[PDB]
Amino acid sequence: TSLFTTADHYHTPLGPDGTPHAFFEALRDEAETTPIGWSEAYGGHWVVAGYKEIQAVIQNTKAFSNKGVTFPRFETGEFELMMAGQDDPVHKKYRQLVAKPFSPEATDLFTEQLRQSTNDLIDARIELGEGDAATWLANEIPARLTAILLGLPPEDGDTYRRWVWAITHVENPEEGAEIFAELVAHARTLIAERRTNPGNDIMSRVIMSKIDGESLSEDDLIGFFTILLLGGIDNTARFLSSVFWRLAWDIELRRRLIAHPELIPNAVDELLRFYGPAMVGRLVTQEVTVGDITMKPGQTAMLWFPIASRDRSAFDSPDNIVIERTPNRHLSLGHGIHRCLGAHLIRVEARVAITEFLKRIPEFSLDPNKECEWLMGQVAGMLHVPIIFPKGKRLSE
């Protein structure tokens, strides 16, 4: 028997702690013998679990295409995820258009805005002594930042979350497609507005950009809008939710971050290794052998980053959160030409969120009378994290 045979990133067995990590540890153990295995899920596909094997696949862009970046494919109608859904030479030209606004200097500009937002959000429930850290904080900090990056109203987060849920999880395909079509209608209106009144934001930037002398198509612009929306509302929210959950019960980790705030950035990196929400797919375009396995054109390989990030041949003591770990070359943000555009931004966001939360609410715990819930999928992490804490004071009003 093999754990690969029924591996399915949308249906990972959960342990008594509520996470898939016992299952990830068991699959990591099996991957020491068999680092790539066949899953019968989704009609049959390859599951790549060893660290060196994921590296080999993800570097081999001639055989492994980002046309398969989401598997099963995210619901984005006839549109594609810009950059993430493309291969070179096209990929490189599009990524060049937005490299500057995601540079460390450009994203550092938002540090105090995130700090103020985190505190304003905390203000909303600190007097109540209870709240869902996911829906109250982890969802809202990136949703508001992302609305700002895209030049959208920050108070409409539930609308944006409804779109992202349709893209990633709504099971009825007619419903899903129709809600994504609502995103498209809103993006069209935004694009038209920015054409006449261009702002400082990233949409305005790509709308005014040119490639090889020509302006981008509306379809390309909607692809930019969609992937940047997903990065915040999905990936970042699920990561931060998992982090808040971990800090709620792991009183040892928590006291060390409070005693040593200078270790928070390295701790964020180690939490990214351990709770990194993402996996990605690759479409096989040429016959290719990786280790013992020969893959054929039209097959898909799923890169199970959480398993590789636990590989004993790549990390010492991989099942422990070692906040001083370095160089920590985990695969949670990918590797090679598609490595996460938002890497610096999410590091700033996580550092500020953790720093301010632990400053305001150093004492808290999981609510014994409400359930936590892990969301499974290509982007996986806590969805509900009910916590309790002593009632406190607002900084404002």
For the annotated binding site for heme, the residues are 66, 91, 95, 282, 338, 340
Distance (Å, rounded) from C-alpha 53 to C-alpha 308? 9
Among 166, 233, 278, 382, binds ligand CNL (CB under 6 A): 278
79 touches which of ligand CNL, ligand HEM, none (CB within 5 to 8 A by kind)?
none
From the list ligand HEM, ligand CNL, none, partner contacted by residue 66 (C-beta under 5 to 8 A by kind): ligand HEM
As measured in angstroms, the least distance from the Cβ of 178 to ligand HEM is: 25
Nearer to ligand CNL, 65 or 235 (CB): 235
Which DSSP state fits 327? S
Select from ligand HEM, ligand CNL, none the partner in contact with residue 50, using the beta carbon and a kind-dependent cut-off of 5 to 8 Å: none
By CB under 6 A, tell whether 387 contacts ligand HEM.
no
345 binds, among ligand CNL, ligand HEM, none (CB under 5 to 8 A by kind): ligand HEM
Q: Which of 65, 76, 107, 235 binds ligand HEM (CB under 6 A)?
A: 235
Residue from 280, 290, 295, 348 touching ligand CNL (CB under 6 A): that is 280
Where do the H-state alpha helices sit in 297-390? 305-308, 343-360
Q: Does 84 bind ligand CNL (CB under 6 A)?
A: yes
Closest CA to 78 of 190, 188, 174, 222: 222
Residues 6+ apart with CB under 8 A from 262: none
202 binds ligand CNL (CB under 6 A): no
Near ligand HEM by CB under 6 A: residue from 119, 332, 355, 378: 332
- Between 84 and 358, CB nearer to ligand CNL: 84
Q: Which two tokens mark 62?
A: 């001639």
Q: Which of 20, 131, 176, 342 binds ligand HEM (CB under 6 A)?
A: 342
Give bridge partners of residue 303 from the DSSP assignment: 48, 280
Cβ proximity to ligand HEM, 34 vs 241, nearer residue: 241
Q: Do 216 and 126 meet the contact criterion of CB atoms below 8 Å apart? A: no
The H or E element containing residue 47 is strand 45-48
340 near ligand HEM, rule: CB under 6 A: yes
* CB atoms closer than 10 angstroms to residue 34: 18
The closest of 204, 190, 213, 209 to 95, measured between CA atoms, is: 209
Nearest to 379 by CA among 302, 241, 278: 278
Do residues 223 and 85 make contact, with C-beta atoms less than 8 angstroms apart? yes
Q: Mention every residue, 6+ apart, whose C-beta is less than 8 A from residue 317.
A: none
Range in contact with ligand HEM (rule: CB under 6 A) among 5-13, 14-22, 167-175, 327-335 = 327-335
At closest approach, how far in Å is the CB of 95 from ligand HEM? 5
Does 69 contact ligand CNL by CB under 6 A? yes
- Residue number with the shortest CB distance to ligand HEM? 231
Residue among 138, 227, 354, 372 that touches ligand CNL (CB under 6 A): 227
Asked whether position 332 contacts ligand CNL by CB under 6 A, the answer is no
Tell me which of ligand HEM, ligand CNL, none is bound by residue 244, counting a contact when its beta carbon lies within the kind-specific cut-off of 5 to 8 angstroms.
none
Binding partner at 355 among ligand CNL, ligand HEM, none, C-beta below 5 to 8 Å by kind: none
Using only C-alpha atoms, what is the Rg of the chain? 21
**Residues 6+ positions from 381 with CB-CB distance below 8 Å:** 237, 238, 239, 241, 242, 275, 277, 374, 375
CB 137 within 8 A of CB 357: yes
* Least distance in angstroms from the C-beta of 128 to ligand HEM: 28
Q: Is the dihedral of CA 350, 352, 358, 360 positive or negative?
A: negative
Strand order in the sheet with 280-284: 36-39, 45-48, 300-303, 280-284, 64-65
Q: Which of ligand HEM, ligand CNL, none does residue 233 bind to, with CB < 5 to 8 Å depending on kind?
A: none
For residue 368, the number of C-alpha atoms closer than 13 Å in the C-beta half-sphere is 0
d(CA 199, CA 221): 15
Tell me if 278 contacts ligand HEM by CB under 6 A.
yes
User: Where along the sequence are the contacts to ligand CNL (CB under 6 A)?
Assistant: 69-70, 81, 84, 227, 230-231, 235, 278, 280, 378-379
User: Where along the sequence are the contacts to ligand HEM (CB under 6 A)?
Assistant: 66, 69, 83-84, 91, 95, 227-228, 231-232, 235-236, 239, 276-278, 280, 332-334, 338, 340-342, 345-346
